[PDB]
Amino acid sequence: AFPASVVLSRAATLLQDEDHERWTVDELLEWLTDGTREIVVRKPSAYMKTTTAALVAGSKQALPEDAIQLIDVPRNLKTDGSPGRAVTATDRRLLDTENPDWHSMKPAGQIRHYTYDSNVPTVFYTYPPAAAGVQVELVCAWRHPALTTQNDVVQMGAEFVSALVSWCLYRASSKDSEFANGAVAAAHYSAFSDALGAQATGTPTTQAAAAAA
Amino acid sequence: AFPASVVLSRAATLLQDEDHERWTVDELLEWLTDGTREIVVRKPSAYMKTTTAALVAGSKQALPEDAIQLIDVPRNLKTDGSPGRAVTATDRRLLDTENPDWHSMKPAGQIRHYTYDSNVPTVFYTYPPAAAGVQVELVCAWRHPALTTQNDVVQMGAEFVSALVSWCLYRASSKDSEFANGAVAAAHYSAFSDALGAQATGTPTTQAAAAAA
Amino acid sequence: AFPASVVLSRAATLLQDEDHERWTVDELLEWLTDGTREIVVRKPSAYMKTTTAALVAGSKQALPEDAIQLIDVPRNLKTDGSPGRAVTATDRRLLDTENPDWHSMKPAGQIRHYTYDSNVPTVFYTYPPAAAGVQVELVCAWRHPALTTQNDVVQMGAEFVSALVSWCLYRASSKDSEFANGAVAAAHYSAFSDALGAQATGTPTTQAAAAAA
Amino acid sequence: AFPASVVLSRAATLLQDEDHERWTVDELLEWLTDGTREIVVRKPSAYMKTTTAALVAGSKQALPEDAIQLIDVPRNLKTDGSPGRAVTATDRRLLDTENPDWHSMKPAGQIRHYTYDSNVPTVFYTYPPAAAGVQVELVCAWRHPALTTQNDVVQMGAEFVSALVSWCLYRASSKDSEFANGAVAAAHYSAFSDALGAQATGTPTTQAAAAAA
Amino acid sequence: KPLDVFMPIIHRFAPGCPEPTAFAAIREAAIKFCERTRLWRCDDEFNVGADECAEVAVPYGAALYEMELVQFNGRNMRPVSTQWLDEQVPDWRTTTQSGQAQYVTQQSEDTLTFVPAEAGSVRVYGLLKPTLDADSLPDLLADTYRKTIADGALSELLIIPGKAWMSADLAVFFGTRFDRELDRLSTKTIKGQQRAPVRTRAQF
Amino acid sequence: KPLDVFMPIIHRFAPGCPEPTAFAAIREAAIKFCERTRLWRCDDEFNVGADECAEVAVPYGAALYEMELVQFNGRNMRPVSTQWLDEQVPDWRTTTQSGQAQYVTQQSEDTLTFVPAEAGSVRVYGLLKPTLDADSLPDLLADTYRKTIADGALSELLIIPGKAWMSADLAVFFGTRFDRELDRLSTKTIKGQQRAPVRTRAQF
């Protein structure tokens, strides 16, 4: 939950540009937001929140536009505060082979099972088909919107902040690529990749990609 | 849903040309569209568009021309808004061996099975033959058409902005001029490949290739 | 289905020759057409065209001259629009051991089986022998004819546009082979080969040659 | 079916000699014909010509002089246009052990089997001994006779134009003059070998060698 | 009554199984259960007269698997095979003479034919079997014998190949348990919950 | 009636097999089921006279597997083998004399011959068998016993080689279940749903 002001101070202290004349605050903020998106992609455990999302009528559903991928759909939120029933994942192909018109089935007050495919990121199907905009908490890979101002707050963990520092070092030191043919930029990139690799807490990036559920 | 303006701003910041003088805005736009196409090919999960398409009467059908490869055909759209039946893949050769005149039989209002071969991307067969141009949902790796102007929007996810920037840098720095550098271009190509490699969210690219269902 | 103009614009922006005064439009078009043929050979899934052709009387047949190799013979097109019966591949040697005069058998209105050998590309046999020029759909690797004009259209897919750009970089940069003893040309060739290798969609060139049916 | 003129233009474009003054057009024609021979040898599928050949009466026969090696003998052509019987390969040693005077057996109007040994390319034996010069189709790796003129046509496929160009560059740049370079010659030989290697359509050259039936 | 009571056990042993698939497995397992246990019973009455092969009425989510007995105007009828009429009572099919009914044969799947045709009320006391597409299983199958049907359905579901559910060991184990429980319950038609003894009929 | 009710079970076990091959295998398994269960039955009436080897008439999507009983103009006839006629009744083939029919002979596949030939109505009550190409199976196969025919068909599909659906253990298991269910239902001809007892004939 750190603000962008700290990260800009760090990156303006590594590069001997404190008043931000070679690297203005706007472009450093741009590198901060790009690094946040990239680090969320690399390690999904960095930035997860559960979002209340209503579902349009029909089996076919679309997750919120600024979300990379939904990992879990734990609880189906009942009307107003009631937590309601929970949801478990299932496979679409079996739902398709038998009862082929399962999309035409009568809509349900509460969805029971959802189908998700890593190939198709934005689309997940709900069984039974949703009715009248029932809301469900979604655990999805949300992407950080942007960093427009220095005081703007980054909702990410407070060590990925140092990871963002290293990534901004990469994206700034590739500008003066003439020196050492970008060796320093490659060094910062290697440092950043190692920083996320040795993250023992979150999703292990060193191990098999997408192995963690 | 990011516009091309932001990515062109990046590429103008990386290459030490913010005025877009040596690298014209049209040229950077062209590299942006090339990068979008390349990312769609490398990782099909980057841009998969659910397109409802009418089917020419008969067993043989043609994929929409602006589609790399169809991945699934989830729903057979019934007339007007009704989702209709689902469609499951089958084997074309067995459809040939039994009922050899399967192309010549009576068409069906709703197709029941589809056969797709990777070797032939532009042709997919439907069983039974479609009638009166019945439309079906097609989930295919869409190719981003073009980036005519700076304010044009890119329909892919905002997370691949780093990969697009790396691709634009690789292609622009490969120019045969004093202001372009070669080792920088090679390092940028490597950076693009690595950035696509660590995309733990979408379709894997390093470990498993072309094996995604 | 991109025109040659877009590819020539690419190559004229890579090499700092916009007027095409070193690399004339004619020879760049020549490199484009050579690259198209080479890329179709490397990955037959890049450009697969289904062509209807009449079959001369007799078991011995010849596929259209502008085709590298046929993969499948899906439909035996009945007279006029009727799709007709389908065809499946068989073994010619077993057709020869028994009924050794299977070429002298009475010609059939519709061929039932075809035999194709990868060794002999231009010749494929049909069982029963064809009669009176019956037309059969042929799925054969068509070779791009030529690029005589800038406005001429290349009907191959639209990331092979970037692959053709890389190949044209190879062929143009092989002229100035002095610089680094052709290291830049070798780098462009490696880039082209990697671009085709990581084509996750079409036929995998990385895996065993001709393994895909 | 491409004429030699196009390939000569390519070679005059790679070597920085458009006027053909140093590398004479006769020399490039010779390099083109040598490249055709070498390509047929490396990959027999490049040029396999189905020729009807009369057979001298007797068991011993010789394939047409302008043929590197016969691959298949599909049809024993009956008199005039009738396709006639098919022929299947056998083992010569068993044909000699049983009925040792098989050469002395009465000639047959149509041969029934043929024996071919790779070690002795110019001789293939027929069983029974042929009678009155009966003609039979031979499928053999034909060698391109010569390229005497610029306008001479090449029966080889247009896909191997890149391999022919690379071979012409390899042989021309190996010349011992100031105007030729050696490192580019080695690189061109490697490029020719790689271009023939990744010919996924025809006979494989890297993985399987001489094992094609 | 609904299959949502069966579903939790399937979820526990077959993780995240699709609801239609688990429901089809429940229906099939309960069908086999009623084939073996024969516990479900329902009572039906209809009017039959003047030579029609009348079909038995059954609940929508049921099918008549086996008739315990049939009564016709208060008479206990004797069920016999068709060949028994063929050899003992000739001109069965041809004759149209009406009379008081004595024997029943089932020429079709669900139609009862009485050797003399007559107009009277017919009461069929028969066992039932769930249909292959039944939304709600009876109280007997759900409330007290949910575990056995669940074991059978888990066998069917774990046998499904190419899925995360697939495990041959659990499939065989649940199949054996289902068979053993069905086998124990086979005698419940005669014994019941009342402990009615089973005694062989004696012919002298 | 249509096979699309059989299809969900197959696509549950064999996910993407083409429908025509699945239909063919379902029909083949149904043929085997009706050969073993012998449950499908139908009757036809037609006229035979003047030494005519008439053929039986059956529903179009079916074939006459076996004649349960043959009646000529109200007489229960005794089927005999042709060799039995050659022994007991000489001059069967030579003679042309007309008389009251006594025995039935099936020289051909579907043609029934009477040792006395005369002109009269023929009523045949014979078991039915689905043909190799029948679009719709009858009700008793599909509605009630779709699981067993699905078991057989799944066996034939899972036997298919060199394809994603191949699985030897699954095919063996499904074939064993099909065989056991056929074995259990073999007696339904005598029994039916009415519980008719099976009693051996006594010969004195």
Side-chain angles (χ1 to χ4, degrees), chain A residues 94-188:
Chain A
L94 290 175
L95 279 167
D96 273 27
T97 49
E98 40 177 40
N99 209 353
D101 45 44
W102 69 283
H103 309 276
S104 310
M105 171 195 265
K106 174 133 181 73
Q110 263 194 140
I111 66 166
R112 255 167 283 288
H113 300 299
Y114 81 100
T115 65
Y116 195 35
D117 201 8
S118 295
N119 282 33
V120 182
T122 69
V123 178
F124 77 107
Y125 291 146
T126 60
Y127 183 80
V134 295
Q135 69 275 17
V136 182
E137 293 83 3
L138 260 57
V139 178
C140 62
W142 186 260
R143 54 164 62 95
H144 203 278
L147 277 296
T148 187
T149 58
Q150 193 204 40
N151 58 5
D152 172 346
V153 60
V154 188
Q155 294 82 17
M156 185 179 288
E159 293 82 3
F160 311 116
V161 56
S162 177
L164 276 296
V165 170
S166 180
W167 172 273
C168 182
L169 294 174
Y170 181 75
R171 267 300 187 244
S173 286
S174 65
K175 182 185 287 184
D176 51 1
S177 295
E178 290 106 299
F179 184 73
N181 296 343
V184 57
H188 295 105

Side-chain angles (χ1 to χ4, degrees), chain E residues 11-12 44 47 103 121 128 145 160 168 179 189 191 201:
Chain E
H11 281 292
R12 184 209 306 175
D44 304 69
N47 218 324
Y103 323 111
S121 177
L128 294 175
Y145 288 130
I160 297 169
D179 180 47
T189 53
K191 301 197 68 64
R201 286 260 325 267

Side-chain angles (χ1 to χ4, degrees), chain F residues 19 21 33 75-76 98 108 124 140 143 191 198-199 203:
Chain F
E19 280 173 345
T21 80
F33 180 91
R75 296 190 46 179
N76 261 333
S98 58
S108 174
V124 172
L140 62 84
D143 173 12
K191 311 193 67 57
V198 191
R199 295 183 292 180
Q203 306 297 29

Side-chain angles (χ1 to χ4, degrees), chain D:
Chain D
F2 63 90
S5 164
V6 296
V7 189
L8 303 155
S9 166
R10 330 298 172 80
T13 316
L14 277 296
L15 314 163
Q16 293 174 70
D17 177 24
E18 291 255 30
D19 276 295
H20 288 104
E21 65 183 1
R22 295 190 180 90
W23 292 272
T24 45
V25 64
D26 201 355
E27 184 179 1
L28 289 194
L29 294 174
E30 205 296 319
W31 291 133
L32 201 155
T33 184
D34 276 344
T36 55
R37 318 288 186 82
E38 209 60 7
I39 278 154
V40 177
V41 170
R42 301 281 190 91
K43 183 192 310 296
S45 179
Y47 191 19
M48 293 177 70
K49 182 183 175 185
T50 67
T51 184
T52 178
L55 307 158
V56 183
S59 47
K60 179 181 286 290
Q61 312 280 359
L63 61 83
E65 57 274 21
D66 291 331
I68 297 169
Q69 153 165 319
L70 62 83
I71 301 299
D72 273 308
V73 190
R75 301 189 314 182
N76 180 354
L77 194 65
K78 197 173 320 162
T79 318
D80 59 82
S82 179
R85 179 153 206 267
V87 190
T88 56
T90 60
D91 187 306
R92 210 187 53 70
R93 263 191 290 202
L94 281 72
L95 269 166
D96 295 306
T97 53
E98 271 66 0
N99 210 354
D101 296 331
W102 71 284
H103 307 274
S104 310
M105 183 190 316
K106 67 181 178 67
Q110 294 183 323
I111 67 164
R112 281 157 29 212
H113 295 303
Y114 85 100
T115 65
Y116 189 66
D117 198 10
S118 170
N119 294 341
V120 177
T122 175
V123 180
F124 74 103
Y125 286 96
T126 63
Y127 182 71
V134 59
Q135 69 276 17
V136 172
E137 321 315 336
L138 270 74
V139 176
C140 64
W142 208 259
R143 45 161 52 94
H144 203 187
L147 277 297
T148 180
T149 59
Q150 206 153 40
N151 63 7
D152 199 352
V153 66
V154 187
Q155 303 323 139
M156 261 185 48
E159 61 275 10
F160 305 109
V161 67
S162 174
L164 277 155
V165 166
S166 183
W167 184 264
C168 286
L169 276 296
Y170 166 55
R171 298 304 281 265
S173 58
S174 67
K175 185 184 286 186
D176 281 353
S177 74
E178 288 181 344
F179 313 97
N181 193 356
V184 65
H188 283 342
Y189 186 40
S190 171
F192 166 77
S193 180
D194 291 7
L196 282 198
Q199 286 282 131
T201 62
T203 299
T205 56
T206 76
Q207 280 288 119

Side-chain angles (χ1 to χ4, degrees), chain C residues 11-203:
Chain C
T13 61
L14 277 296
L15 301 84
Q16 187 66 41
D17 182 21
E18 191 46 10
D19 190 348
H20 316 90
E21 41 176 60
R22 296 197 38 122
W23 293 269
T24 48
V25 289
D26 201 356
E27 65 183 1
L28 285 193
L29 276 181
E30 152 61 37
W31 295 132
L32 178 59
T33 184
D34 264 6
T36 53
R37 294 142 148 182
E38 181 285 349
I39 190 168
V40 175
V41 171
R42 197 181 283 289
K43 178 192 303 293
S45 178
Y47 175 66
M48 191 35 87
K49 172 173 60 74
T50 299
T51 300
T52 179
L55 279 297
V56 67
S59 48
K60 171 152 271 163
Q61 310 279 357
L63 60 83
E65 71 276 40
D66 280 27
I68 307 90
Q69 158 199 78
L70 62 84
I71 299 174
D72 214 356
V73 183
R75 302 201 271 108
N76 185 358
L77 183 63
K78 188 268 183 181
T79 301
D80 53 68
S82 178
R85 188 182 176 92
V87 190
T88 54
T90 56
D91 189 305
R92 184 250 281 161
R93 214 151 51 181
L94 281 182
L95 279 171
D96 279 349
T97 50
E98 65 183 1
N99 210 352
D101 62 358
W102 69 285
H103 310 277
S104 310
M105 171 195 323
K106 173 103 171 143
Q110 283 210 109
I111 68 167
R112 256 167 284 288
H113 298 298
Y114 82 100
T115 64
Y116 186 74
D117 200 7
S118 295
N119 281 33
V120 182
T122 69
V123 178
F124 79 111
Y125 294 120
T126 60
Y127 184 109
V134 297
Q135 53 274 70
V136 187
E137 318 292 299
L138 282 193
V139 174
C140 61
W142 183 258
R143 53 160 62 96
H144 203 280
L147 276 300
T148 187
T149 58
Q150 203 204 50
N151 73 17
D152 193 304
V153 60
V154 187
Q155 69 276 17
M156 162 155 37
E159 293 82 3
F160 312 113
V161 65
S162 177
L164 272 294
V165 175
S166 179
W167 173 273
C168 182
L169 294 174
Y170 181 76
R171 276 312 183 190
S173 281
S174 179
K175 198 155 34 173
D176 52 0
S177 294
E178 195 144 19
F179 194 70
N181 295 342
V184 57
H188 287 105
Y189 183 47
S190 307
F192 169 79
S193 298
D194 198 18
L196 275 296
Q199 296 293 321
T201 62
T203 300

